[model samples]
Target: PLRLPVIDLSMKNLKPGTTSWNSVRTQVREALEEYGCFEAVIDAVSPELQKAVCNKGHELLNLPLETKMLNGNKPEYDGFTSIPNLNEGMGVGRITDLEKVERFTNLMWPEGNKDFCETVYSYGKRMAEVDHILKMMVFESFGMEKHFDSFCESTNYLLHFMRYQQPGKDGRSPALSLHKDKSILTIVNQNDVKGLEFETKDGEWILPTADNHIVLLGDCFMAWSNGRLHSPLHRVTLVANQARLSTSSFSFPKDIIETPAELVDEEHPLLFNPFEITELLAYCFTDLKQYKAYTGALEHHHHHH
Candidate 1:
């Protein structure tokens, strides 16, 4: 059984100003230091926002395949994804496979509401708020000043909202493949069903409970800590004959202007290294040198023949 720490942001008698801030800050810090994953239930999300997201999802999923394909992941829409298109086994590279993209695209966009465009925009905006708040807590937990405000000014920030539909009994997989997220933090809202688990260590799968709360896990936190606390290795199992549905929001930091942030100092090193998104993208899309712009030359440049 996977036990995730549960935290309530509500303080009983603490005054609403400094005291409340201090109390909540301490709670967030402690949780991050412990589980790498935790729940902030009371304010995890607004009820209205939740309903809106679900409603829009249903509408989008109902849309005809032709309409959805118009907004496919080819250019990488900064928000919203359909089901069965994304592969749990492969990382983003696997997106090159058209079959996999179709699977996720078709299931995710349900057709119905004519206001599909507005709904997608509105839902993303609201969810972005929840994601932002959680990320702020993450920066605070890492002893870093709030970095969210800076990202807001830069249009490079990207957010994703996922809706997992239950594909019925015959449509279950033994386990979801293990893959690290390419973002800062992942917030997931699973259905009332079970069989969801995260890896603790060495291929061990731990079951997570679905208690009307969302699961927030630090993705690159372990990397920042020099591999001290592990990033989450999670998979969904197909034990029972029933199906499962879930929703997840992946929040990635944004920065324009290719200037990298200063490295965390000797006294308190950053949990994860900082690199401009452009550099990271080059590293991914090409055989570019590591921090090439800083190094001024590729490391693999010369060798005695």
Candidate 2:
């Protein structure tokens, strides 16, 4: 029920170096460091486009279970995922590229769904702009703008469509359970219904409203920032009887991620050793099968690798 740290990128005065941008940057850093997430309201993606994409997402998930299963073969959660009564997600890896989105759209509906293909692709393209700006703010917030360009060179995005089903005939686990993401920074934009919740440092649960894009820091970012930021545990619940459909954009560094020298000075010594996120994925599904098992694997690899 807590109002999240909200930011509107569409505002005119938010330009970098301006007072507004500095104040906003402070909130962004505080939110990521304390809450591990914040709400981003962007005007780039029209509300109609968001509506179309959310509607299209339901159609994408409605496909036969077999077709959904076809989405597998990538790293970890890039495939089909489901949790009855609440929670069904499909990850479209590298969605920033039109070709990848088209390929996934084709595979999902061999008959051809140009509407779905275009809508999702366009949305992803627009979201990428906001993603870039947000990342820039992150670097500036840390006074590490010097490395922002290099970070952009290796950063990549993955898209996820999540459908939290309504309370229905069958029962699902009471909750999706609080958990941290594998992404570097995760952005979630939802339709009208409310459901997602993020836990705060004080253990209070924050409820996000509709139409705002949210950025959640992930474990990789925490390591990259040398633990200066947090990747809080979060979960989804069926708030009302209505179902919730959402699109999440996850930005991560494809190259090896290391605590930057700037973030590693005396006050905050090295907390996590440099590691490749993809390598963690390889160890997860291929070696260990479950994720929480790979949770501490981040620091473990530091010693064991």
Judging by lDDT against the true structure, name the best candidate.
Answer: 2
CA displacement after TM-score superposition, residue 295 of candidate 2 (Å)? 14
lDDT of 1: 0.46
**Which one is best on TM-score?**
2
Model 2, position 66, has a per-residue lDDT of 88
Q: Give the TM-score of candidate 1.
A: 0.62
Residue range 1-305, candidate 1, lDDT tens digits:
55666766542422334666566656655655555556556443456666565555445445565655455334232322333633211111122233433444444444423343444444445445555555555555555555446654533233233333444455445544454544555666654555556665456556666775544454334433333334565666655555444555555445332212432333333333445544454354231123333333211213223
| lDDT of all predictions | 0.46, 0.75
TM-scores, all models, native as reference: 0.62, 0.86
Candidate 1: misplaced stretches above 4 Å? 9-18, 42-49, 74-122, 146-148, 155-175, 201-204, 218-230, 256-273, 276-305
- Candidate 1's displacement at residue 135, Å, is 3.0
Q: Spell out the clash pairs found in candidate 2.
A: none
